[PDB]
């Protein structure tokens, strides 16, 4: 029943290596303290993680010991998993106060602030399992490609970051960061996406947070809360839009530059999803090296036709470098 | 102080802060004159001004409470202007014969809060906010009726009791009314008897004079409500104010599942006006 | 199982008696040379000749009795009174006369309102609507009242089913089928009537082009069926209702579909 086979790569101590990568740093105080605190200070959202510095760190951690497991290959090998792993570590080292944060000030921060206030109060009163770490962010982690002038270290084959043809794209690049290039096509207009969307109950309240996973989710009613549940009888609950965390979403297709097309065939477009800060960065008719994790988003059905599963994919945008500023 | 959820705009606080807002020129940098004009005609729909609360003190914060949280602030503002009508009448003693004129429904129509840049610029982070928009109207949809107070029936006995909609949902009691009677059998919902309220829909191109050039402009469907319905025709390039809304849509088909990408439309509490 | 009992109709009975007494009593203004006696008893008696099972009474006459206070119950709350106005009227006919389908059509409303002036407050209420007809359609039967049963298997229940769904019969049965089961469709016991849909459009002289005039559905139920013509303005009896085509009903998408139980070529 669903066999298991070990792999040399382990995320446990790699997380540890991420933690040692963050807030302990020299070469550029350190950059990850200031770059993080400026986000904590809420003048900044996008966290641009360069793979270049991850490359710089291993040198200090190898030769120059003590030797450790590799990231730069292990990241781009997966690169989806690190967004949920490499980025959560930031939560553990982040400055708490941090400075002059207040409440309002910001819209919707007061909501959650009062959530945790009433939750703390009511829990500390009841005792006389917590809001998910993804709801409280207000920042986005973006990796960038290593071209690179310093990639000549050399780790050689380590680079993708290979400004490849759309034709060069294979089903063996899915789940691996790949730069691509071409003209922007159709550049669909921005619409809000969704992440948690904690619906509100009625009688006894509380909250529940439904994870937004893949493309879509099924909405639930019943009651999750034990208080409204069974007595009496099932409390009614509705989604509150103010409470939800919205991440900008913009999709756009990119046809090949047509010089990269052989004597035959046809220009082939590739669908690209955008999130957070990188939104609106893209404009129609513009050649751009777009880098991102290359992923499928199945299937929404259909599901009879394929069979299977015939993923059809898309490219998650991560970084954006346009030709001709 | 009566904290209200996450909007945290306090009842029995801002009501008084608005109540002493009365009688001001002042400032400026009308107000009671235009209201005194309003009381005779019975036209209701107080258009306000915006900006008033800014820079004026008190209620420098109320402007920010409305701008950041217009949903509640408009309801509270309507309650307060109603009770300030009630307090206007007692000043002149017996008025208009007598108490019925106060019972009639009133509302505030805020407009021109800051200058917003386009639809296009808008962040997904602000979904309850007052948002200026401008563009021509490609079409005015036929009127769709909207639930206000719901009616219900059963095979037994039959009984006529009914319940209001409140929030955007309808829950009828399984069993039952009056009495009792019971039995478990499903409720019979009369379609025609229940009350309705006018909801139009208005398509709006985003500022055809302001465009990426050559990309064709993006549609913004603003749904209006009440009096505002059928108050316009087409192609009006002027401006509109109202609260932004993102609501889930049902997808494929059936299935009772959410597409997980919420569509966005404007509540458009106020409109105005010409060229 | 005894049903105890029924409730309460209150005002509906008051309107039943008022309307009955109104259709009975004059209802006469003119004296000497009339226009006197009755006219509505004489209306039903004149109706006994062709027996086309419809009546015509003026709204203006109906407003005169109570000074319009009677006409108000029959105005905004009107659809509440449809089953009462019919059976009540029959309680009259049974007295004065010896296979019953009765279509009541009021007319001559004090003010004509355009399709643009149509509001959600006007629902369940008589409103006169003027405008040109577009896209008439072929006459087909309405289920009206049906016997659909059995329904497991001998029941033969004939009742109700008047509302437009048409689902379903056989619910709260027989006594006692306990269906469920088949519906089951029986069309020989079910009387039918009328009808033809017309899509009414505002006249072109009023509409300020650029306009793009907004059409709306009016279905003709009643003997006024076929009286309508394409390319011409007509005045109707309001009964605005709504038809399914927003919240949900949990343990709905609606639009204005105007009804007319009377037609005239005026305009
Ligand atoms: Zn609850």
Curated annotation (Swiss-Prot), chain A:
User: What are the subcellular locations of this protein?
Assistant: Cytoplasm; Nucleus
Which branch of life, at top level? Eukaryota
Miscellaneous section: Present with 166 molecules/cell in log phase SD medium. Early fractionation of eukaryotic MCM proteins yielded a variety of dimeric, trimeric and tetrameric complexes with unclear biological significance. Specifically a MCM467 subcomplex is shown to have in vitro helicase activity which is inhibited by the MCM2 subunit. The MCM2-7 hexamer is the proposed physiological active complex.
Family the entry assigns: Belongs to the MCM family.
Q: How does it assemble?
A: Component of the MCM2-7 complex. The complex forms a toroidal hexameric ring with the proposed subunit order MCM2-MCM6-MCM4-MCM7-MCM3-MCM5; loaded onto DNA, forms a head-head double hexamer. Interacts with CSM1 and MCM10.
Q: Could you tell me what this protein does?
A: Acts as a component of the MCM2-7 complex (MCM complex) which is the putative replicative helicase essential for 'once per cell cycle' DNA replication initiation and elongation in eukaryotic cells. Core component of CDC45-MCM-GINS (CMG) helicase, the molecular machine that unwinds template DNA during replication, and around which the replisome is built.
Annotated protein name in UniProt? DNA replication licensing factor MCM7
User: Where does this protein come from, organism-wise?
Assistant: Saccharomyces cerevisiae (strain ATCC 204508 / S288c) (Baker's yeast)
- Which gene specifies this protein's sequence? MCM7
Q: Which residues of the full protein are shown?
A: 4 to 386 of 845
From Swiss-Prot, chain B:
Q: Which family does it belong to?
A: Belongs to the MCM family.
Query: Cellular location of this protein?
Result: Nucleus
Q: How does it assemble?
A: Component of the MCM2-7 complex. The complex forms a toroidal hexameric ring with the proposed subunit order MCM2-MCM6-MCM4-MCM7-MCM3-MCM5; loaded onto DNA, forms a head-head double hexamer.
Q: What is this protein called?
A: DNA replication licensing factor MCM4
What range of the parent protein does this fragment cover? 177 to 470 of 933
Please describe what this protein does.
Acts as a component of the MCM2-7 complex (MCM complex) which is the putative replicative helicase essential for 'once per cell cycle' DNA replication initiation and elongation in eukaryotic cells. The active ATPase sites in the MCM2-7 ring are formed through the interaction surfaces of two neighboring subunits such that a critical structure of a conserved arginine finger motif is provided in trans relative to the ATP-binding site of the Walker A box of the adjacent subunit. The six ATPase active sites, however, are likely to contribute differentially to the complex helicase activity.
Query: What's the domain of life for this entry?
Result: Eukaryota
Q: What else is known?
A: Present with 8800 molecules/cell in log phase SD medium.
From Swiss-Prot, chain C:
Residues bearing PTM Phosphoserine: 211
Q: Where in the cell is it found?
A: Nucleus
Q: How does it assemble?
A: Component of the MCM2-7 complex. The complex forms a toroidal hexameric ring with the proposed subunit order MCM2-MCM6-MCM4-MCM7-MCM3-MCM5; loaded onto DNA, forms a head-head double hexamer. Interacts with MCM10.
Q: What does this protein do?
A: Acts as a component of the MCM2-7 complex (MCM complex) which is the putative replicative helicase essential for 'once per cell cycle' DNA replication initiation and elongation in eukaryotic cells. The active ATPase sites in the MCM2-7 ring are formed through the interaction surfaces of two neighboring subunits such that a critical structure of a conserved arginine finger motif is provided in trans relative to the ATP-binding site of the Walker A box of the adjacent subunit. The six ATPase active sites, however, are likely to contribute differentially to the complex helicase activity.
Q: Which family is this protein grouped under?
A: Belongs to the MCM family.
Q: What else is known?
A: Present with 13400 molecules/cell in log phase SD medium.
The name under which this protein is listed is: DNA replication licensing factor MCM6
- Which organism's genome codes for this protein? Saccharomyces cerevisiae (strain ATCC 204508 / S288c) (Baker's yeast)
Q: What is the lineage of its organism?
A: Eukaryota, Fungi, Dikarya, Ascomycota, Saccharomycotina
The gene that this protein is the product of is MCM6
Task: Please tell me where this chain falls within the complete protein, as first and last residue plus total length.
Answer: 97 to 463 of 1017
């Amino acid at each position: 029943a669903l066999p298991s086979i070990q792999l040399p790569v382990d995320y446990n101590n790699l997380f540890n290596e991420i933690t040692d990568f963050l807030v302990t740093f020299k070469q550029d105080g350190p950059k990850y303290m200031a770059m993080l605190q400026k986000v904590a200070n809420r003048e900044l959202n996008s966290v641009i993680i360069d793979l270049d510095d991850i490359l710089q760190y291993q040198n200090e951690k190898f030769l120059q010991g003590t030797q450790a497991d590799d990231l730069v290959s292990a990241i781009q090998q997966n690169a989806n998993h690190f967004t949920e792993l490499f980025c959560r570590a930031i939560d553990n080292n982040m400055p708490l106060p941090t400075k002059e944060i207040d409440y309002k000030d910001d819209v919707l921060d007061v909501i959650l602030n009062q959530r945790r206030l009433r939750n703390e109060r009511m829990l500390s009163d009841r005792t006389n399992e917590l809001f998910p770490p993804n709801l409280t962010r207000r920042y986005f982690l973006y990796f960038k490609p290593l071209s690179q002038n310093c990639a000549r270290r050399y780790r050689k084959k380590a680079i993708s970051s290979k400004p490849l043809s759309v034709r060069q794209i294979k089903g063996d690049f899915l789940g691996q960061l790949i730069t691509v290039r071409g003209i922007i096509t159709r550049v669909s207009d921005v619409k809000p996406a969704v992440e948690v969307i904690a619906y509100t109950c009625d009688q006894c309240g509380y909250e529940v947070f439904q994870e937004v996973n893949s493309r879509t989710f099924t909405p639930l009613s019943e009651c999750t809360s034990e208080e409204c549940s069974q007595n009496q009888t099932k409390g009614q609950l509705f989604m509150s839009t103010r409470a939800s965390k919205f991440s900008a979403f913009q999709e756009c297709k990119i046809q090949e530059l047509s010089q990269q097309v052989p004597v035959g065939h046809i220009p082939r477009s590739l669908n690209i999803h955008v999130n957070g800060t990188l939104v609106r960065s893209l404009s129609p008719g513009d050649i751009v090296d777009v880098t991102g994790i290359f992923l499928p988003a199945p299937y929404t059905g259909f599901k009879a036709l394929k069979a299977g599963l015939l993923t059809e994919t898309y490219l998650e945008a991560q970084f954006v470098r346009q030709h001709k500023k | 102080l009566r904290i209200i959820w996450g909007t945290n705009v306090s009842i029995q606080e801002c009501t008084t802060n608005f109540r002493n807002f009365l009688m001001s020129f002042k400032y400026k940098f009308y107000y009671i004159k235009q209201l005194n004009e309003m009381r005779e005609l019975g036209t209701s729909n107080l258009n306000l001004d915006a900006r008033n609360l800014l820079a004026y003190k008190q209620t420098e914060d109320l402007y920010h409470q409305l701008l950041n949280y217009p949903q509640e602030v408009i309801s509270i503002m309507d309650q307060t202007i109603k009770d300030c009508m009630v307090s206007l009448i007692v000043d002149n003693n017996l008025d208009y014969d007598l108490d019925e004129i106060e019972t009639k429904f009133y509302k505030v129509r805020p407009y021109n809060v800051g200058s917003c840049k386009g639809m296009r610029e808008l962040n997904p982070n602000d979904i309850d906010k007052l948002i200026n928009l401008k563009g021509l109207v490609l079409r005015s949809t036929p009127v769709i009726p909207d639930m206000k107070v719901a009616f219900f029936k059963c095979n037994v006995c039959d009984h006529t009791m009914a319940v209001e909609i409140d929030r955007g949902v309808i829950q009828e009691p399984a069993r039952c009314e009056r009495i009792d009677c019971n039995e478990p059998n499903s409720m019979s919902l009369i379609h025609n008897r229940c009350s309705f309220a006018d909801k139009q829909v208005i398509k709006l191109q985003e500022t055809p004079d302001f465009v990426p050039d050559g990309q064709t402009p993006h549609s913004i469907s603003l749904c209006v409500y009440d009096e505002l319905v059928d108050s316009c025709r087409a192609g009006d390039r002027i401006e509109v104010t109202g609260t932004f809304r993102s609501i889930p849509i049902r997808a494929n088909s059936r299935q009772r599942v959410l597409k997980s990408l919420y569509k966005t439309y404007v509540d458009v509490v106020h409109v105005k006006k010409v060229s | 199982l005894n049903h105890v009992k029924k409730v309460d109709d209150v005002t509906g009975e008051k309107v039943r008696e008022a309307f009955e007494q109104f259709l009975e009593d004059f209802s006469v203004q003119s004296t000497d040379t009339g226009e006197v006696e009755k006219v509505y008893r004489a209306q039903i008696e004149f109706m006994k000749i062709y027996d086309l099972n419809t009546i015509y009474i003026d709204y203006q006459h109906l407003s005169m009795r109570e000074n319009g206070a009677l006409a108000m119950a029959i105005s905004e709350q009107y659809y509440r009174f449809l089953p009462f106005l019919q059976k009540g009227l029959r309680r009259v006919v049974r007295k004065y006369a010896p296979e019953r389908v009765f279509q009541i059509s009021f007319f001559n409303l004090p003010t004509v309102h355009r399709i643009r002036d149509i509001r959600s407050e006007k629902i369940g209420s008589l409103l006169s609507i003027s405008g040109t007809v577009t896209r008439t359609s072929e006459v087909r039967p309405e289920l009206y009242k049906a016997s659909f049963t059995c329904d497991m298997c001998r029941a033969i229940v004939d009742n109700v089913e008047q509302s437009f769904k048409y689902t379903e019969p056989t619910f709260c049965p027989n006594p006692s089928c306990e269906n469920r089961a088949f519906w089951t469709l029986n069309v020989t016991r079910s009387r039918f009537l009328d009808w033809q849909k017309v899509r009414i459009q505002e006249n072109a002289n009023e509409i300020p082009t650029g306009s793009m005039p907004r059409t709306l559905d009016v279905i003709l139920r009643g003997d006024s069926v076929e009286r309508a013509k394409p390319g011409d303005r007509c005045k109707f009896t309001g009964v605005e209702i709504v038809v399914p085509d927003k919240p949900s009903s949990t343990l709905l998408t609606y639009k204005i579909s105007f009804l007319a139980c009377h037609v005239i070529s005026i305009g």
